[model samples]
Target chain A: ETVLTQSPGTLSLSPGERATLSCRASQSLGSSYLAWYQQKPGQAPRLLIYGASSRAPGIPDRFSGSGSGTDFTLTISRLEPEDFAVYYCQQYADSPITFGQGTRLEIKRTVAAPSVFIFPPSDEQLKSGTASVVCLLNNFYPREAKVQWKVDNALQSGNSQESVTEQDSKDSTYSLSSTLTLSKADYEKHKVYACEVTHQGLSSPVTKSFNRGEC
Target chain B: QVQLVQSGAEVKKPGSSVKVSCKASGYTFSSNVISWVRQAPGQGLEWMGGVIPIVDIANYAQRFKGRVTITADESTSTTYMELSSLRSEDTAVYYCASTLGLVLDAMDYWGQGTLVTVSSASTKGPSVFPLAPCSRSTSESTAALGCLVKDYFPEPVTVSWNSGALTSGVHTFPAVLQSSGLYSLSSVVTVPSSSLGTKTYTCNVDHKPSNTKVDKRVEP
Candidate 1:
């Protein structure tokens, strides 16, 4: 088993600037058996480079990979608006394939804080005996956010809280939504169920609470 | 609308051969390429090979170059993979995926994984037991629950959590070979203290060698 370490946890660069990311293997890779991937906010990783330096089909020439043995590098000649995402490196020469943590290429600027909104369950859901509360965070930057559910101001975990984060293609901002579902009986017992969002853009945690009577 | 529906699980003895199928639908199969990936129990993804049906062209990873064969059938819009002389390490979940480009790229559509269990002639099933909070920490925010699997043959096993919520803090230790030639493993999950007494979580253990699935429920 080989371990891959990606350096410079975060690379702050503008759209036109060049970005170079590095991945170091625990030992000699034996051959050029490395691959690079680009991952956006809510999408699966897209393969950019394979076989160490060979670019995958449709990958722009701006994205190139190099290095061998114990060191590998992924260089973006000029970062595009879409390229300001996280990148990862993987090695497959050994029995147990492994991947590097990731390097984030972020735009060097401060962005607006997200607006939080909470919606109560619909009539259809209420009739079905299950209530689902939806919390939405709109127009945030940097793509890192933490969402949690709180019942009566006590941090709650292990609830069916499904969260999804997406990047807005037009503005390059991020939007996220989290849904919490529970039985109607349980929902009535709680005084307030709040959705708390924590992000770098916010001076304090943004919370929106849903009252049982609101439904 | 593209879909790659693969065959079901297969259990075969060591040294035997097995063939898995992936049936494509909602698009022209010959015009696209299908790639195969392998993930052993508690292991990461491995690229095995890929096939372009229209050109009858195929490429394979160096490690699986000879032991695995990949082919396609235009009539059935199906892709097939045949691995011969299986070994214990061949036990894994095989996935058939497709990309948008002519060459294998980032997989866009994928088939539900098909489990392949390679076992020896002699095998033993595992027994699962649930253990209460194992964490000695004085923290009141989180608690740990454990599951122990004992007396299983064939080292590879999978431990999963069915907690209804997101699984964030799960730790599965490596299997330990006991002096009696049996294997034992433990899996622990950390959940918020608020989830205790009300939330129910299940620990699932899949012992592919003996074709056994055991689940233990824990309520703290």
Candidate 2:
């Protein structure tokens, strides 16, 4: 298997946004003789960044590479409309001349407001009469939104977990869900539960609330 | 404007020899390193090695050391790769690129790839034996044809359905490694029994290392 792994698998950002891409290798690439290429639809990939940080001959100044040894980064300081395509990193510091699997960047489509769902499961209740609250955040943009919960108007960390992320391929939006496990006593005590979503573009956290005995 | 223009596609029999050429232009070919790479079907790239065209110094990847040779014509600004004793495993697309150093160098420019498939003789090909006769299942009148290629030398060989043409409904299994260090290959093509009529089903095998091709035609 190839040793190179690219992060964020995909990026959907508007023009002029700075995009930072990473390619990490399993072992050292001595002189950092690494190269980056840009591939547009239907065309052969073009060399962009090489020798770690130096742009290839005739390559534009918008693209830059910086890294050494095993960690490397490819930065598109300001993405142009034409920069929405796939990028690959190649390591020539050794034989095999391996290449990164590839990372994609494209224009972000307007995302719809998120839909929050909270489901309280009854089965598998803990010995202490505890149940789990599953919160699903659906259809959000920018993909960096955070989900939190509040109990009786107070933020509750209370043993929770979150999933990596799930992408909607067509429009390049994202969604994820988190689970908060708590004792059933909190619910019967007339406490309030709310799922809050916070995104960079939003003025304030988007909140959804449910009260005691609410299905 | 710097580029490496490579040779066209080639299909040669096993045991036969073939040389690929890559012509460079627009830049000082002698000022950098010219190298060759190979990509087998559905596989990653493999570096064959490179040559300092200016100094005429050549080096091969340790894996290809004895089986392949790298040479350059400084006068013509051309680089040549001669892969000898070809085998079916040699079937792949080869490309040439230019870089600044011998080791730890980045390929700044690359040539379009050239594909090469080593085959066996067209007639009187290798000895092919059918494992069993084609049998039909009454309900659908379907039948399958299969054969076994034994003791093929230089191991890797290509296998395909009748008449040497690969088409839909044909599944050619890869050559199997035999315990004796030789190789064994098998392939089966399924057709409606009614369609097997006067048509002859054959096993086409090409052994590149020996530069030989063989076919076995069958009729139920």
Candidate 3:
């Protein structure tokens, strides 16, 4: 019997929202060609990521991938209303191909916050007044989680405006977070900002979108 | 719809030997292939080997590349695997899995389990003098089954049960000897109906030097 196993489970969040996911293997998923699939309650499984970290033929740019070796991550910069579903990773790597259990993309109704928090708290005049939201996934197991930050219908990562981290453990999940900061005046122009989480069931990804809206 | 049900537990001594079987029922016994796997006492599944009953085509894991040999009798819809020298590692639970070829490397079928414990004891298999009243029809029902050792010397020995109405028969076979020196043996007995919940069947490797240590069964 092939010694394949899946992650326990994940709970996530929508567009103007974000989620970062991770997939790990007891051995390396390198040879088995890692691919990911998405499953919603009523629909059939759809291809998301494939061939290491490349998106499947028709996937959107908002969905990106990074990391290699045993630390592989798939990130959805924005959680679209259409992105609610479970994600999985598949390694065509070796003999019995396997998958990680799943991370969910649950929708959280976080449209209002009494007090606004800032990510990377501003070093400038208007930086502190603006509200910024960051999703912190620390003390993760197996390895660290990938982070994706979404703002105003846009995907943001590896840019000067935002900083997302990747790190992990075997039994505990890693911390992967996305950050969005808004100036007091700039905060009024955007309606929502979200963070998405993804991982594998069978080399698959599950997502959760955290939504933060206007005060 | 043929089914195979095995018994549980076998106790054997070190340096002795043992062989077990899988019985086929429901469908034609000769049609499908029989497979075997070993799960180290507390470890996960380990593929041992398998063979096609009709042509006798067989394959083994890299470790057991040559240590064991697998054979079958298509006419009886049964297959067998054998192991000569027993060890503590060999004390693990072995399973007889049934599968058909969909592709070359993938297998998608299974059997419940057969567990044999190897210990060094020479008891007459739970026998006692007739102290209680003996019934005739009841006595005849216990006499139907027999232990037929095809390879090892079969001196006149009592079957595991007391002339009980045995629906099936006892089985013993051979296994491959892997490069790693590990040994395993297995056999399959096909049944008549679609599936059998799986009952107990036993096999003892009647050795000359000491006592027999291989006694176990598998259930559906």
DockQ of each: 0.04, 0.08, 0.01
Which digits, one per residue and each the tens of the lDDT, describe model 3 over residues A1-215?
Answer: 12334332554444477677777767654532665667554233456766656666668998876655565677788777677667766554453334565666555432221111112222232343644343433223333244455666577654312222121112112223333445567555555554544433214333323333412
Task: Estimate TM-scores for all models.
Answer: 0.52, 0.48, 0.33
TM-score of chain B of each: 0.62, 0.55, 0.49
Model 2 ranges with Cα > 4 A deviation: A8-18, A39-45, A80-86, A94-97, A104-215, B13-17, B40-44, B85-89, B101-103, B118-220
lDDT of 3 by residue, B121-155 (tens): 33332211111101112222221111222112112
What 10-residue stretch in candidate 2 chain B is worst by lDDT? Answer: B131-140
Docking quality (DockQ) of candidate 1? 0.04
The fnat of each candidate, in order, is 0.01, 0.18, 0.00
Model 3 chain B lowest lDDT segment of ten: B127-136
| Worst ten in a row by lDDT for model 2 chain A | A119-128
Q: lDDT tens string, model 2, B156-216? A: 5777775556564444444432333344444555566676665677777787767777776
| Better model by lDDT: candidate 1 vs candidate 2 | 1
lDDT of each: 0.72, 0.67, 0.46
TM-score of 2: 0.48
Q: Is candidate 1 or candidate 2 better by TM-score?
A: 1
